[PDB]
Amino acid sequence: IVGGTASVRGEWPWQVTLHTTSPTQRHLCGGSIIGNQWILTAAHCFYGVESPKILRVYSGILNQAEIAEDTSFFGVQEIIIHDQYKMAESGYDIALLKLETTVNYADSQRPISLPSKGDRNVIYTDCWVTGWGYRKLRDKIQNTLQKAKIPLVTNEECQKRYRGHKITHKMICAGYREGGKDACKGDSGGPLSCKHNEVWHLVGITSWGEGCAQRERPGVYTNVVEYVDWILEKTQAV
């Protein structure tokens, strides 16, 4: 996260840090708890990932330093990538991680509500992007979970900033005309959470952007509300 500040422990209880154990353990991407056995994240986070066996999901974390070899984690039983996903910039950058065990909810780890189709008309004015991503294009994974308040921008306005791309209604952007605050490498898969009527909703999933926090370059996120049907269908037992 560029231009953000340290989060308060437990402030974003749905935020998880997804690690890969190959070659050695390290933070890979962010993600959000949306169900007792489900993490919603970005599909592009699994590039080069052949098996769920090398993944570890850690919940209730503020500082990466809290994670040691003796720290408990959730194994991943299955990685579900949207069948239409090709690459972040083309959309459909969404994936589900089915955990091997269920998360026991507590003040430090609980699910975030998904947006309702009836809220697509609602204008969010209190949105935050969080993560352990870079603090600057050329940086490294941060120890403390960072947060930054960023205003949503209309898709028409976003399209104007990315003339070489197609900003679809399945995407949502957030940023300052002057830049300065934005997600960055390592924040991918994490949430764009907006508080509306005292209730937090998972509005977007950190996906991509031209560099990080640049002027006239809003961050691009997966528009979660456009995938509630997909999420329901994929998270059904059988």
Curated annotation (Swiss-Prot):
Q: What is the effect of changing D119G?
A: In FA11D; mild phenotype
Q: Which domain of life is it from?
A: Eukaryota
* Consequence the record notes for mutating V16M: In FA11D; dominant-negative mutation that results in severely decreased protein secretion
Q: Residues in the active site?
A: H44, D93, S188
Give the Peptidase S1 domain ranges: 1-236
**Entry binding sites for heparin:** K160, R161, Y162, R163
Q: Which residues are glycosylated?
A: N63, N104
Phenotype for G31V: In FA11D; mutant is not secreted by transfected fibroblasts; dominant-negative effect
Report disulfide bridges, numbered on this chain. C29-C45, C127-C194, C158-C173, C184-C212
Q: Can you name this protein?
A: Coagulation factor XIa light chain
Give the organism, scientific name.
Homo sapiens
Q: Give the gene name.
A: F11
Of the intact sequence, the residues represented are 388 to 625 of 625
